[PDB]
């Protein structure tokens, strides 16, 4: 249990982040050219709260694991340089300090 409240409050705090407007929804294969053959496991901050609401979070560890596929993909897909890239290291970089100062 204690786990996954401090799950609800790092996902929480990256939703209404400034710099998580890339991520709040899935990435739509038809708009973006090429996403699809790039990266294929896509995760988004819409589908770890469907999953965190279901239940579908065993520990901790797994909803780490979407996060960082989160920022993962994000690095492989866009420029380090691109406005997407650069929303996303901010991201990332939040995501890592708030998960260490839980754990
Ligand atoms: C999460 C991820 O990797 N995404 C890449 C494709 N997306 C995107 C949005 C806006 C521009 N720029 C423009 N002028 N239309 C480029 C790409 C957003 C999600
Ligand atoms: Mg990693």
Same mark, same amino acid.
């Given at each position: 249990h204690s786990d996954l409240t401090f799950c609800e409050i790092i996902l929480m705090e990256m939703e209404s982040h400034d710099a998580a407007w890339p991520?709040?929804?899935?990435?739509?294969?038809?708009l973006? =050219?090429?996403?699809?053959?790039?990266?294929?496991?896509?995760?988004? $901050?819409s589908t770890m709260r469907e999953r965190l609401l279901r239940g579908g979070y065993t520990?901790?560890?797994e909803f780490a694991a979407d996060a960082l596929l989160v920022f993962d993909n994000c690095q492989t897909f866009n420029?380090?340089? =691109?406005?997407?890239?650069?929303?996303?290291?901010?991201?990332?970089? $939040?995501?890592?300090?708030?998960?260490?100062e839980f754990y």
């Open positions: 991520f709040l929804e899935p990435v739509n294969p038809r973006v =050219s090429g996403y699809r053959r790039i990266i294929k496991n896509p995760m988004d $901050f520990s901790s560890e420029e380090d340089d =691109s406005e997407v890239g650069k929303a996303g290291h901010i991201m990332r970089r $939040f995501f890592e300090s708030r998960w260490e």
